[model samples]
Target: TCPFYKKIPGTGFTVDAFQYGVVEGCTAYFLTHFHSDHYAGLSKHFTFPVYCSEITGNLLKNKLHVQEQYIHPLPLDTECIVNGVKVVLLDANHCPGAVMILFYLPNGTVILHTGDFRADPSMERSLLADQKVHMLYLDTTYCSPEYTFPSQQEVIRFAINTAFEAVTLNPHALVVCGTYSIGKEKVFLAIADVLGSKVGMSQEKYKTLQCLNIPEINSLITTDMCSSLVHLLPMMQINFKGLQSHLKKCGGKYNQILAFRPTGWTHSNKFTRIADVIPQTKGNISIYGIPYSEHSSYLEMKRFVQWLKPQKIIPTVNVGTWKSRSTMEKYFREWKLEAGY
Candidate 1:
């Protein structure tokens, strides 16, 4: 669910407030990413000064068919002034073209709105990391202590190793990677690279992925299904029925289908084994739901908040439920107090 507070109080700015449709009392709309939840109401009919990254702008134009005049594309890691407020876009490390918006209000209020992000060690080395953040609108997708999953790199390694193993046993088997509109590219890209196989996806998917700014994408991807052993399909087709139909479409060339279901919503009691990721299999389809998440784990969030040590911490997710919000706020306040108080 979108956060209750869309409009930044007194700043007259709306961050990821497109779904509300013509947000009240706000002139500038700052979209954090192209995720459906964040960019819900955006379409060709949308009329507003939308500010986002360059790649996001291209996607808005190509995917949504939104007019170019209304969209303002901001380059990454650069400061630009918009109506007296200085704004900077930092890589959010969540998805392709995703960004964390940093706003410096005229009254000395430095607000950092992280739409959705996965905290990494490289974040601390940012050139502009020295600025004191007065307000932090955090990405609280996994704000609880129980939601701590494995690192993205670790999960990616597991996925690659698993895929390599499955393919080694049955080289003719199809590697079906379930993907979103614009996420988890690293996993599939690495998979294809390590296996030395080209990728196959639909024209629509390729067009959208072009906006991802992956320089070597053309050489790695192919529209002709016969040319590539790896197929990157939408998450909807990761099931047995869908894979069966997909196999039929591929001229029954594959003996089995290895469905790589990548997402954060997976549980593994043990992280030491590659077998942990594969929960089950049905007939000719093998379902492997790896713990691949773009959002920060509970521990990562805590580490970021403790390190940033901002003056104020605001939870941008789990605010729909009072209890969840209260729980996150408790943790946020705890981290802030313990860090500097």
Candidate 2:
């Protein structure tokens, strides 16, 4: 929130500002989630009060070991005043414990910093309902027309069906779902629930999932990879070479593998249209690069912008280059055109 999300001039507040070191006149710091890109540059070397969701607090404590005194886990949807500014945490619908920080400045400016989020239906009837936003710090990661991907719900089904189809063809074919340290839980969880199978992941990864208190977590995960046919692996090991070697560690139960790589970049270069996207296959190995993006697609962002109708929009990502900035500005203005004169 701090790097490009900006430090409020008078609030004495910085959002996700660890990369910049100590703020010149800061009173409180905020973290949206525990993702490295968002929580980057934070360490025990730096110390300050950090306001974030409780789950992120657990991760900070366990993962980074930030000083306990500095960590402030704010309750969701609760109105609280700190250093003369009012703030609220709304479910971001992006990752575990990620939140869209809402700030009501002393001057009555309503600022919503969506650290990183997927557009959700509940946001329209939110705390900001009927209230106009003064500033919107948005996650414009997939803010281009070419990013016309389907909804997460649809993609979740696609991922599930992909697994179902794989197993229908080869019951013994080992299937692995890719993931980040804290995201894409829904896809793998759905597979486990529908397939009636226990998921396999590392003890460390399972520990992070436990932080969310996922109700099915205890019965859902097994530390032993060999016990479960479906293994949840980090993104690094999702590739052909990486997966092949790891499968070898499985002790020959499975000769063939079906890897699911869920990411936004799955749409890159391969297809000119969303419908053209398909799986890559060769022999007994198949990599289904499903567009299971955690970020909102261009259409989803358009709907969000149209619904929120913020007075101004600030992109948190892909604003570095002139071309990227200019292209993004065109899309913003296009949405504005659709909105009015």
Candidate 3:
């Protein structure tokens, strides 16, 4: 049972907090991802055995400091039967640690929940040999033309190429790119690899990233590499000007002082104003706009729905996307236009 909908007192179930309680009579809980929307209540509310991928479990450990008792680590693609329900984890490549869950109910029903995925169907393709999914709990984050996005690798290349250009002009300068600490760890690693021997991080973050593939990319994570690069982490308490002031202290060592923000920055009213001000910095600081995102785009969503060809697809991850039944119905209606499915 999910937590977002709860039965109101003397009334029927209604959408509420991103919180959910365990089925009073049930003994298991399967978490799909660490995003607040999916797991906001798990830290306190649920006490049953929680199953998730190792990467996600490590992410919880590194980010939230959640312990083992609450997290049962399952390797990706592995199958485990709990209480007569077969559970499997499929890669959902939205972030470094995301997953799509497959469940086989005792009554001979199979359900697939694609938490937050992108175009790369490597994960989906791998799962095909196992079983056919009967029902899909889909992710429709970009189920609208406005949110259509390119590939993750493409976005990474764009961000890196842009950052590389900035650093190439001023190899001694510091450029900061903001993102979720856990979500963007790999992106940061990619940047570090490009600017090898000059990039560095706070000791703790260095250690975490190091374990993932750190030493191999060490040339990119160094005091000298970062000397020409501003490493402003995404933070709630700090402002853009605050970071600019800090970067200004770097002086001529860097060609410019800039902060790269993620998709959420576009929605913030303060984004433009923040870009305009920065007392201590010189050589100009601007926010490099890039459409890098983790979730799958509208076409990817439509493609998956067509491939699965389920009797009915009930999307779960698009609470804010246009794929809410009403808008997506038209696309689903034209499913016949696609040849492969």
- In terms of lDDT, the best-performing candidate is 1
Clashes of each: 0, 0, 22
Cα distance off (Å), candidate 1, residue 76: 1.4
lDDT, residue 33, model 3: 67
What stretches of model 3 exceed 4 Å from their correct place? 1-18, 44-46, 62-65, 202-232, 235-240, 249-255, 264-283, 320-323, 336-341
1 or 3, greater by lDDT = 1
Please list the residue runs of candidate 2 whose C-alpha ends up more than 4 Å from where it truly belongs after superposition: 1-4, 268-277
Name the Cα RMSD for model 2: 2.3
For candidate 1, lDDT tens digit of each residue in 1-341?
43446666557789888776565677799989999998988999988899999989999999998999999999888889976788899999988889998888888888888889998878887744778888889899888776767777788888788889889998888898988668888878889888898888999998888787898888898888888889988899889999899999988688888888876754462344444544568887888877788898888888887877787777778777889988888897778777775
Tens-place lDDT per residue, model 3, 202-289, is: 6665555543423455655644433535473644413457556766655646545556565522333224333232233334666555
Q: Compose the digit string of candidate 2's lDDT tens values, residues 174-193.
A: 88888876887887888877
Least well predicted 10-residue stretch by lDDT in candidate 3:
7-16
Off by over 4 Å in 1: 1-4, 269-275
Give the lDDT of residue 199 in candidate 1: 87
